[PDB]
Design a protein around this ligand. Structure first.
Ligand SMILES: Nc1nc2c(ncn2[C@@H]2O[C@H](CO)[C@@H](O)[C@H]2O)c(=O)[nH]1
Ligand SMILES: Nc1nc2c(ncn2[C@@H]2O[C@H](CO)[C@@H](O)[C@H]2O)c(=O)[nH]1
Ligand SMILES: Nc1nc2c(ncn2[C@@H]2O[C@H](CO)[C@@H](O)[C@H]2O)c(=O)[nH]1
Ligand SMILES: C[C@@H]1CNc2nc(N)[nH]c(=O)c2N1
Ligand SMILES: C[C@@H]1CNc2nc(N)[nH]c(=O)c2N1
Ligand SMILES: [Cl-]
Lengths: 245, 244
């Protein structure tokens, strides 16, 4: 069991954050010992936002770099911070508020696929294996010590869509164990191997390079499939076509 | 892996439904092979509705006993139906649409704690263990064949609140397995054991009887604890700590 009176601050967004809050409640963390930092109510965040209002869990939507956010953290005085698809870089001083530190879920086997769009890139690059990494947060993205990783096979029929959702689902299986590792002061291990990096931008601006091989085009089309967003674009005779995927 | 082109209708509500759709998408079920029947958008169902809108997943909020609900299922032609906290009785003729049948998640070890508010009665009644049952649905609530059960210990500090949430979390962790049972035509097993049934309201209109033992009082307090609902009353008593 988690230490009694453990104070947990969840920074997050959407279903993973809703699930994390559910998990914490299920672990017996009291409502007054849960706080959430999230973003302004969205499509993807209606679930979380309504849950927080309904249960009277304190929350902020202040920007991560704002004073209000820092005060929210400070007044709460978390023991631990759990980032569950929180979009923004969390300032180091906010992290320092939690003397048991923090954990964040990243959908790659770090230090591979640092950056964003990790699911799309894994597919673009023809990986047959990827995974997720619950890792302590340091002041930069994607760099902190690994608390838990798990491998996820990439199938030749996976899309960014299917892999993204499997990533979430599979990662949720491990969440309770991760919270316990935090609870118990598991230092985790410094990330190992060579880091790869991918830019915030949509891969190749969503545009198929005609010089790619068919295998690379197939991968890219899959990597680009993510309803409701536009699919991969093919330009022909100066004109845009969305692929059927 | 789930059979290609399997068509899945999720009848559900709130996070368990959202998690189910997420699980399906991860399993490679395409959006046009998912349909959702749910209830209106509300404070416990907006996450699901937002997902359905964002991903353009076809859905209905028609009442379970309505022609519109039936026509939604018939049009979609599910292979399987997954009920994830769907409140209402799904009519037999709707279940009949899915050749691979259905499963529903019920937060007890069926046939114990049929009915509603199972988590609160589990605590009131002093159970030391409970669990969840993924069971095929027949025409009645809570009576169909068991596909999967998992036991959950009920701790001395558990409240209706914590147990309700742990039920969901733990049950979600078995969902993928259950969907694959459905896919594979696992017949499950006929329910066996001591049936019980509890409905709706906890007794005593939330009122602590000082004749009860401290063990009874503590259980009642914990069973009544479920933000944002009022707690047990003696004046409002949200913990035994406060009670003493
Ligand atoms: N995880 C991760 N996210 C990033 C990185 N760079 C940018 N982002 C995300 O995309 C936004 C940049 O506009 C940030 O707020 C992050 O949400 C990175 O290196 N790692
Ligand atoms: N294709 C595509 N995939 C995305 C986007 N954002 C996240 N995944 C986007 O804008 N386009
Ligand atoms: N205390 C309490 N718990 C509930 C209620 N409904 C579901 N769980 C209610 O009205 N009161
Ligand atoms: C994805 C998350 C969100 N924000 C983070 N903030 C810091 N500081 N460090 C991080 O690693 C992360 N990753
Ligand atoms: C809880 C769920 C919701 N609806 C059901 N409908 C039928 N027919 N059979 C059922 O068992 C159930 N249980
Ligand atoms: Cl039970």
């Amino acid at each position: 069991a988690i230490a009694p009176n453990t104070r947990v601050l969840v920074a997050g967004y959407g279903l993973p954050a809703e699930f994390c809050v559910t998990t914490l409640i299920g672990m017996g963390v009291e409502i007054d010992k849960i706080a959430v930092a999230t973003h302004r109510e969205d499509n993807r965040n209606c679930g979380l936002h309504s849950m927080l209002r309904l249960r009277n869990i304190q929350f902020t939507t202040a920007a991560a770099n704002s004073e209000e956010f820092y005060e929210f953290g400070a007044n709460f005085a978390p023991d631990m911070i759990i980032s569950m698809h929180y979009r923004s870089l969390i300032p180091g001083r906010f992290l320092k508020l939690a003397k048991k530190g923090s954990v964040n879920l990243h959908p790659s086997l770090l230090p591979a696929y640092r950056g964003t769009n990790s699911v799309a890139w894994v597919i673009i690059n023809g990986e047959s294996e990827t995974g997720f990494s619950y890792h302590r947060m340091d002041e930069n993205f994607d760099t902190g010590a690994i608390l838990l990783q798990e491998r996820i096979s990439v199938e030749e029929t996976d899309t960014a869509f299917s892999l993204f959702h499997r990533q979430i689902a599979r990662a949720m299986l491990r969440l309770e164990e991760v919270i316990l590792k935090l609870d118990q002061g598991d230092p985790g291990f410094a990330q190992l191997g060579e880091a790869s990096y991918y830019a915030r931008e949509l891969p190749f601006g969503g545009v198929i390079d005609p010089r790619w091989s068919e295998v690379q085009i197939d991968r890219f089309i899959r990597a680009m499939f993510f309803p409701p967003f536009p699919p991969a674009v093919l330009k022909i005779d100066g004109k845009v076509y969305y692929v059927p995927s």
